[PDB]
Amino acid sequence: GVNNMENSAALLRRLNHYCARALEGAASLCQTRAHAEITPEHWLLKLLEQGEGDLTVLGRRYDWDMDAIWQSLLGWLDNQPRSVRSRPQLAQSLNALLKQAWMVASLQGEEHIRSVHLLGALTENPHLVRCDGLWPLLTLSQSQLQRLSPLLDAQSDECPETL
Numbered sequence: 001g002v003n004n005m006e007n008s009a010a011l012l013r014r015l016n017h018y019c020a021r022a023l024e025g026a027a028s029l030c031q032t033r034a035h036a037e038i039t040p041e042h043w044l045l046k047l048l049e050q051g052e053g054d055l056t057v058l059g060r061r062y063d064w065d066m067d068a069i070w071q072s073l074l075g076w077l078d079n080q081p082r083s084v085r086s087r088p089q090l091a092q093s094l095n096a097l098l099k100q101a102w103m104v105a106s107l108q109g110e111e112h113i114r115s116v117h118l119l120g121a122l123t124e125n126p127h128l129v130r131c132d133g134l135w136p137l138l139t140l141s142q143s144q145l146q147r148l149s150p151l152l153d154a155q156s157d158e159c160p161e162t163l
C-alpha cells in the first residue's frame, strides 16, 4: 500500500547524486533493450561508466583488473533475455540491495547512500549479484570499507563538498 510505496520512494531520495544518476542511466539502458527489470548489474555497469566514485577509487587502490569487471558486466548484459516491458521496474534484488545499503549507511549515522554502501551491502549479501566477474567487489569486508572512509573522502567524486 501507501506506506510501502512511500518507503521505497524515500529510499530512492536518499541516494546521493552520483548513485541516482547511475540508477537513471541503468533504467535508460533497460528501456533501450526493452528489458523488464533493472538489476544491480545494470546499476554497477553505469556506476563504473561514470568512473569517478567510490568503486573506481577502491579498484585503483587495490589494483583490481577493471577491464575484466567491465567485460563480465557486458557479457552478463548481452546474455540477459528480453522481457517485454514498455518501461522497466526495479528488480527484487535491486530493492533488497537499496534497502540494505540504506541500513548500512544509517548504522554509520549517514543521511545519504553512496556507492561504498552498495558495496558494503553486496559484500554481506553476495547473492544479490549473479555475475562471476564481480568477485573483486567481494574482497573487502564492511569493516575495511568503513576504515577507508578518509581515503574515499579525499579521492571520490561522492565525497562531502566541504571540509
Ligand SMILES: [Br-]
Residues within 6 Å of the ligand: 047, 048, 050, 051, 052, 053, 054, 055, 056, 057, 115
Ligand atoms: Br565508481
